[PDB]
Amino acid sequence: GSVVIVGRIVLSGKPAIIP
Amino acid sequence: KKGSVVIVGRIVLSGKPAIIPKK
Amino acid sequence: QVEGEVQIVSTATQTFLATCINGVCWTVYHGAGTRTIASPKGPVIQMYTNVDQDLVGWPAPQGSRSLTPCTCGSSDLYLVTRHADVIPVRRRGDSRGSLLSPRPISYLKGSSGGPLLCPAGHAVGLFRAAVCTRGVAKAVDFIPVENLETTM
Amino acid sequence: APITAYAQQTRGLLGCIITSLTGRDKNQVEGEVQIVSTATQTFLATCINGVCWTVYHGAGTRTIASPKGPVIQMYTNVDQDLVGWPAPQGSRSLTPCTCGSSDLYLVTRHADVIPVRRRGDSRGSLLSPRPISYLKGSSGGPLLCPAGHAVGLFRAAVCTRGVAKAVDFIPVENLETTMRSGS
Ligand SMILES: *[C@@](=O)([C]([C][C][C][C])[N]C(=O)[C]1[C]2[C][C][C]([C]2)N1C(=O)[C]([N]C(=O)OC([C])([C])[C])[C]1[C][C][C][C][C]1)C(=O)[N][C]C(=O)[N][C](C(=O)N([C])[C])C1=[C][C]=[C][C]=[C]1
Ligand SMILES: [Zn+2]
Ligand SMILES: [Zn+2]
C-alpha cells in the first residue's frame, strides 16, 4: 500500500493569506 | 514633513495548532 | 495558502502523524514501515528508513512547511496530538517525558509520529509511543530530533 | 506555550505610501505585534498593556496612521529609545513578565521565535547565531519569556563579521519608567 495524507495541522494556527 | 508610521502587516502569537480546513 | 508542519497520514491498517523537519517528512516505522508516500505524480519512496530507531522519512510533501529543531535544551516539552491538542510533557531524558496530566491512551491514539515541541515551538523529538499504566497514558517515548539529524 | 507565531501582510508599497501621507489607515488590526513601516525603513511595534510601543530609532517622533487619521505619540523617550501610541483598535496586548525567567524567546518579523539566554538585564545570547540580515526589520519586536510575556523589545544586534551572537533590548521596566517619566 502507500501512505496518504488525509489532513494537515498548522502549529501557529494561521487562518489564511500571506506573510 | 515626516509621514506617519504605517502598519503594513502583523504577527499573531495567540494562534494555537489547528487542523487546516479543507477547500 | 497556509502550510502545515504536521501531516495526518493513513495506511488502511492505521492512521497516525508525520512531521516535516529539515525538509524531510518524518514518521514512525511502526506505522509506515517501508511504505511509499502518495503524491499527485505517483508514489515517492522513503529517503530514510531506520527500523533500529523506529524512524522513516520521505521528502516533505506539498502543503507542508518544515519545523526547526530545538536549540535551547528546554525540558518543558509540549506534545501535539492528531486533533491539534497540546499536551504539556516534562522531559525525563533523551527519549522519555512524563505528561503533566495523564490521559486515557485514546487521547494519544493516532498521534504517533507527531512532534514534541519546546517553549519556542521548535522540534525536540518525534512522539514514538505512549507509556501507559492501565489505559492511562502518563508518559511518552519519543525519538529525539538528533536521531533525525544523525539519520540525515 | 509553546510560543508559535505567524505573519500576514496587509499593504504593499503604494498603499503604504498613500497611507503614510494621508495618515488615514482604514484596514483592520489583529495581533500583538504590528509590522510597521515609514518611508525609509520597516520594523515592528509591540503592543504591551494597551500601548503600541516601538523603537524610537525607527519611528522617530512620527505619528501613527489610523482610521481616524494620524495619532500622536503618548510617550517619547529618546534616551531609552522608546516611543508609544495608544494600541490600535483590534490589536491584542501582551503583559510584562512576572517570573524573572532567564530564558527568553525573540519573535522576528518572519514570525520566527529564536531562543536567547538573558546575559544581563538588556542583553542575551543567541543559542544559535544568525546573520544580521535575519534580524534586520525586527527592531521593536518582542522578547518573550516561556509563558508569552513581554521581557523586552529588540533594539540592536551584538554582531561581528556580519553574524549576530547576541542582542540588546529595551527591558520592559524601561517602559513602565518612560510612562512614569514626564515624556
Ligand atoms: C532595528 O532598529 C535594528 C535591528 C537590526 C540588527 C541587525 N536595530 C539597529 O540597527 C540598532 C540601532 C541602535 C544601535 C544600532 C542602530 N543598531 C544595531 O543593531 C547595530 N548594533 C549595535 O550598534 O550594537 C551594539 C549596541 C552592540 C554596538 C548593528 C551593527 C551591525 C550592522 C547592523 C546594526 C531595525 O530592525 N531596523 C529596521 C531595518 O533594519 N529595516 C530595514 C529596511 O526597512 N530597509 C529598507 C533596509 C530592513 C527591513 C527588513 C529587511 C531588511 C532590512
Ligand atoms: Zn527550544
Ligand atoms: Zn514570565
Tally of residues, chain D? 183
> Is residue C4 within 8 Å of residue C63, measured between CB atoms?
yes
Q: Do the beta carbons of residue D113 and residue D106 sit within 8 Å?
A: yes
A18/C contact by beta carbon, under 8 A:
no
* DSSP conformation letters of C30-66: HHHTTPEEP-BTB-B--SEEEGGGTEEEEE--TTB-P
Residue C130 C-beta-side C-alpha neighbours within 13 Å = 24
Radius of gyration for chain A, computed over Cα atoms and rounded to the nearest angstrom = 12
The topology under which CATH files domain D1-94 is Thrombin, subunit H (2.40.10)
Confirm or reject contact between A19 and chain C (CB < 8 A).
no
Q: Cβ(C7)–Cβ(A4) under 8 Å? A: no
D138 lines ligand 1 (CB under 6 A): yes
Q: Output DSSP code: residue D154.
A: E
Distance spanning both ends of chain D, measured CA to CA:
35
Beta bridge partners of D125: D117, D166
What resolution in angstrom units was achieved for this structure?
Answer: 2.6
The residues near B1 (Cβ < 8 Å, ≥ 6 apart) are: none
Phi-psi region of C33 (alpha: psi -120 to 50; beta: other; left: phi over 0): left
Q: What CATH code is assigned to C68-152?
A: 2.40.10.10
Distance CA D156, CA D169 (A): 7
Sequence-distant (≥ 6) Cβ neighbours of residue B7 within 8 angstroms: D10, D11, D25, D27, D29, D34, D35, D36, D37, D45, D64, D65, D88
- Cβ-based contacts of D6 with chain A (< 8 Å): 10, 12-14, 19
Determine whether domain C2-67 maps to CATH 3.40.50.800: no
- Per the CB < 8 Å rule, is B17 touching C86? yes
Q: Which residue has the cell 497516525?
A: C16
Q: Which fold has domain D95-183?
A: Thrombin, subunit H (2.40.10)
List the grid coordinates of D53.
Answer: 510601543
Enumerate the domain spans of chain C: 2-67, 68-152
Beta strands C86-93 and C96-104 are antiparallel
Q: Are D1-94 and D95-183 the same fold in CATH?
A: yes
Experimental method: X-ray
Amino acid D165 reads K
Q: Which residues are paired to C78 by β-bridges?
A: C88, C117
The DSSP secondary-structure symbol of C12 reads S
Ligand 1 atom with least separation from CA of D138: 36
Q: If 0-12 CB within 10 Å is exposed, 13-18 middle and 19+ buried, where does residue C41 land?
A: exposed
Instruction: Say whether D79 is catalytic.
Output: no
Give the contacts of C134 (CB within 8 A, at least 6 positions apart): none
Ligand 1 atom having least distance to the Cα of D135: 7
Overall residue count recorded for chain B in this entry:
23
Task: Find, among C99, C2, C12, C11, the residue nearest to C56 by Cα.
Answer: C11
Is A4 in the B-facing interface, judged by CB distances under 8 Å? no
